[PDB]
Amino acid sequence: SARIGEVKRETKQTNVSVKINLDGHGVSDSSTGIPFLDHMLDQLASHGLFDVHVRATGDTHIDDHHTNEDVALAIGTALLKALGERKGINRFGDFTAPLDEALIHVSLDLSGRPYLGYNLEIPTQRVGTYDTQLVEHFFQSLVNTSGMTLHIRQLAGKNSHHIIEATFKAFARALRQATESDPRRG
Amino acid sequence: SARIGEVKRETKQTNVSVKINLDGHGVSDSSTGIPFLDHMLDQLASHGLFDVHVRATGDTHIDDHHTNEDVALAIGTALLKALGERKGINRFGDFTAPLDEALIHVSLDLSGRPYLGYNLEIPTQRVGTYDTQLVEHFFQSLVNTSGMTLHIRQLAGKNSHHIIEATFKAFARALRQATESDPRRG
Amino acid sequence: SARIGEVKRETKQTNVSVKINLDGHGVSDSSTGIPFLDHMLDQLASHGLFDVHVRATGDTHIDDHHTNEDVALAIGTALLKALGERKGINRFGDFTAPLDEALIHVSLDLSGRPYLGYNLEIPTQRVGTYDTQLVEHFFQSLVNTSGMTLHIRQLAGKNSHHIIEATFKAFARALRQATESDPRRG
Amino acid sequence: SARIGEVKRETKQTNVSVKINLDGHGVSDSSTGIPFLDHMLDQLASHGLFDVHVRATGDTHIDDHHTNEDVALAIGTALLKALGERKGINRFGDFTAPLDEALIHVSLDLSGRPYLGYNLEIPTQRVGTYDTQLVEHFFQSLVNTSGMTLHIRQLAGKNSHHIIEATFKAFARALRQATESDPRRG
Amino acid sequence: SARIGEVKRETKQTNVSVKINLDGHGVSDSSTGIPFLDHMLDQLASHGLFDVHVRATGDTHIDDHHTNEDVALAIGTALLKALGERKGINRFGDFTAPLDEALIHVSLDLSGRPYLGYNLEIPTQRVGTYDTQLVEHFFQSLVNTSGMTLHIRQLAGKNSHHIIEATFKAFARALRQATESDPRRG
Amino acid sequence: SARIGEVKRETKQTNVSVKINLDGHGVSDSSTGIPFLDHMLDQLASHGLFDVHVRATGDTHIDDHHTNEDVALAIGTALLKALGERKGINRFGDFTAPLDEALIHVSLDLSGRPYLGYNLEIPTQRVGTYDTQLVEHFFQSLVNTSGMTLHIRQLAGKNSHHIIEATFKAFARALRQATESDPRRG
Ligand SMILES: O=P(O)(O)OC[C@H](O)[C@@H](O)c1cnc[nH]1
Ligand SMILES: O=P(O)(O)OC[C@H](O)[C@@H](O)c1cnc[nH]1
Ligand SMILES: O=P(O)(O)OC[C@H](O)[C@@H](O)c1cnc[nH]1
Ligand SMILES: O=P(O)(O)OC[C@H](O)[C@@H](O)c1cnc[nH]1
Ligand SMILES: O=P(O)(O)OC[C@H](O)[C@@H](O)c1cnc[nH]1
Ligand SMILES: O=P(O)(O)OC[C@H](O)[C@@H](O)c1cnc[nH]1
Ligand SMILES: [Mn+2]
Ligand SMILES: [Mn+2]
Ligand SMILES: [Mn+2]
Ligand SMILES: [Mn+2]
Ligand SMILES: [Mn+2]
Ligand SMILES: [Mn+2]
Ligand SMILES: [Mn+2]
Ligand SMILES: [Mn+2]
Ligand SMILES: [Mn+2]
Ligand SMILES: [Mn+2]
Ligand SMILES: [Mn+2]
Ligand SMILES: [Mn+2]
């Protein structure tokens, strides 16, 4: 049956619930209190064919940082849980996706060793109300709990929304590849 | 008994109440009308083991500047009052604390001569709704009324929230050291 | 009697009322819909000893630009009206004022020829909700309708609020000097 | 009556007595054990029309530093005391004075917030037996206890005695302006 | 009683056993098949007062890399286990230690978030038979499984053995501080 | 009982007597014929809680060099003697202390191998009558006879007296730490 991982975590700052199906149909059901992040999690579901269910609340009066971080941490853990024994999967993923003028290359390995390589240069400080420093932190936190090797390379781009969104498209497609069955490893 | 300092000050712009216990247990009770500052004052309490009670209101319609300044001024005065005759204390504090990639070295002396040395380079203009120029002004104002020699050195950091928060962790730990009894000066 | 100038102007975008007494006592009564500008107009009154009455409404949904501009234009006209025949006045003003680390030199002549020389470098984009580009535009518009020669020189400064506020202090003091009676020109 | 401030302070290192009349006639009566400093305090009295009475002794065997510092601290306190409630005064001062080729601009505000901006470049290490590093320290210490905002800008100069002396002339004249009654604030 | 963590892990490449006592007496009992690493683990025990028991074998015919990595991973896990609920500890550590001309500053937080900041510049490729690239990898792997925030700053140094050994001295002393009881958090 | 070291040495150039108590109460009793050095030795006693008794005479007609050197040599020997078998001590010390704008980091190890790392940049040639080249020589000579590893790093500073004095404060505090009992090495 489908590989599903679920995490619930409450702290004094945030409360987060995540459920991810690696064998999904792109069902997008994310509400973090951070609308731009919800849009990116929808991208993860649609471009990766994951089913993504996220609920979070938190101390957004301070800033979006703790919520963003705790959502990412929980997603990484949910991915780890869903992966189970990791038998028979491709393990590696590699994809370069555009959004108009933006072009982002993502390469990853479900290695069990956390590492983020990241060189995005996002030229504005806010996309809507979303602090663009939080993009790197989202991926770093996700890597840290999932135990993923992840490289994100900005090949082109000028519009901040395009850069970030193309990153999520490429990541989702690379992660779909990595999590799928390898037909010669059954 | 415990060294407690209290200040109340009302101006045409702000109204501030501060009570600080140098011999506290980290009781955090700060409401300034500036949520990010409240978070940093919680850090001061938790990392310093001060009991910190702050209430402020002010002209935040203009910007957070007058409130931030008047809170800092009052805290410096409250620290001065709490210190009393300053007998038997370590006087000096020195600590370097991280928050992830950020690393901040704080050195201080409860000297009676105000000085701020500060080289933070905070790469974004807003953390939540908090103007990052206000960090330096908070420490400068606090130094001016407390009569503290304070040096803040940014050794590493990229995320603005991490840089500022690590600064408060390091400051709190250095100030705890300085305010504690020196076992050989009794 | 006192030199008073009054202007009312309604356009499709803004509605502005200004009354200025050159021989005032620093009565501050400004409500523009732009809180930071209200604070600066209070500075004008208090540091210049002008009585300043301003009411404005406008299309702040778009941005503060049209309101800021129309307020400034009306103030310049009100100053011109109040000056009347300009007999017996000092005409020239010259003052350098600080606000903490900021230091601003203003020199002006009530010449009848508009000119703004301005070299402020305001290092952040927003003070509260006030767009810092609007400072230069305020002075330019005021100069244009008053027919003033005005030079503003930033000698020092780092905090944007301090830079802008010191500018208004220096301007107010220079304008007080220029508008006052010359004891040898009666 | 005249605004007079008096300070006496004895430490293990120095003994200092200061009496300053803000409403003086330039009576110069300074003996610090540092002859060049006595000359500068005479300049303060003569160019500011303060009456300045200073007596100091100290550990000049070590160097002039502690004496210079403690004299400056006491002067700042005496100024603060003499100012009293600060009602009706100009508050701000601004003057540029030469001594031959030297030209020094001083701007100050009796603000209650200490700040020194200082860019003198004194090209020799000793004027007589006076260590030229002590000039900055004199002004810094004075600012710290008086709660003054003070900016000192070297516009020209080559001879060290001229640079330092012009600074005291300009400071004295700016401080006279700041401390005098504002005829419209009675 | 004493906080002890134990890890055993066998892979196709290496076999590692670690037992660490956080409340030790500096008992040094390390045999990794990598003599220079054994020397550094002795330093960890002696300078940290940890009891350190390590046994490892592995594919040193290929190079020391897999053994070094797997030892480090296991040590990080053993530290995590030994820490237990982490109640009442200092949590943060900060120390700068020399070895002759080498001087290394280590700052760490037992945060639960892995991060390594590292700027060593080791000027030779081999210390004995030990590949000096393996130093960074040892700390990175240890951080990854322990969930430690760790910064290592080379302040001075020329001799590779001195640089690496001073790093272990400083790390051990910082980790001792972090793991010890905070007398005010009981 | 208290760890006391005493040295007497007469040469054709100087005559020096030193007695140091590592377990002192900050008793300061130094007379070298070099007043600035006496002030620094008082700092050593007060900031380190050493009891420091020094008497020296010498050929100060030539310059202060031989006296300064011979005092330092004797102090290093006295420290070595007082340390005795060096059992149970912390051995390492690490502290960063300010004096106003100056900030100096000292790290040391009572290693038995002499080394001085020193990067002070003292911007004037004389503090009082004390030749500022003699600061480095004092520490070098002390290191050479004590067998100490000592690093002195200037992090900030402009006033020569402040730079040198902060160095002695930091050194004294680091040396107090190194010489004190380690509670876990009894
Ligand atoms: O690539 P998708 O099919 O998910 O479509 C993306 C949308 O165009 C949208 O999110 C967008 C287009 N430009 C910025 N954002
Ligand atoms: O160090 P603390 O125990 O006070 O925890 C701090 C929190 O992690 C939090 O304030 C934070 C983490 N990243 C940004 N902020
Ligand atoms: O100079 P004033 O007496 O008008 O006082 C100004 C206030 O201190 C205030 O507007 C301010 C201080 N720092 C930023 N703003
Ligand atoms: O300007 P004053 O009237 O006080 O006269 C100053 C003197 O000329 C004197 O102090 C001087 C001239 N050159 C260096 N010093
Ligand atoms: O600092 P320790 O007491 O552990 O002694 C270290 C030894 O001197 C030694 O490991 C060494 C000295 N130079 C390189 N290595
Ligand atoms: O830090 P201490 O308590 O020893 O006080 C030092 C004195 O202020 C003094 O030595 C000094 C202050 N500025 C230069 N020297
Ligand atoms: Mn974070
Ligand atoms: Mn989109
Ligand atoms: Mn301010
Ligand atoms: Mn935080
Ligand atoms: Mn316009
Ligand atoms: Mn203001
Ligand atoms: Mn000083
Ligand atoms: Mn002269
Ligand atoms: Mn590897
Ligand atoms: Mn060795
Ligand atoms: Mn010599
Ligand atoms: Mn001194």
Author numbering:
A (entry chain A), B (entry chain A), C (entry chain A), D (entry chain A), E (entry chain A), F (entry chain A): 9 to 194
Lines quoted from the article behind this entry:
Imidazoleglycerol-phosphate dehydratase (IGPD) catalyzes the Mn(II)-dependent dehydration of imidazoleglycerol phosphate (IGP) to 3-(1H-imidazol-4-yl)-2-oxopropyl dihydrogen phosphate during biosynthesis of histidine.
To study substrate binding in IGPD, we used site-directed mutagenesis to produce an inactive mutant of A. thaliana IGPD2 by replacing E21, a putative acid-base catalyst, with a glutamine residue. This potential steric clash in the form A complex is avoided by the prior displacement of HOH2 from the enzyme. This arrangement implies that the imidazole ring is neutral, with its N3 nitrogen atom protonated and acting as a hydrogen bond donor, consistent with its high pKa (∼14.5) for deprotonation. The structure of form A therefore shows that IGPD links the binding of its substrate to the generation of a ligand-depleted, five-coordinate Mn(II) ion at the heart of the active site.
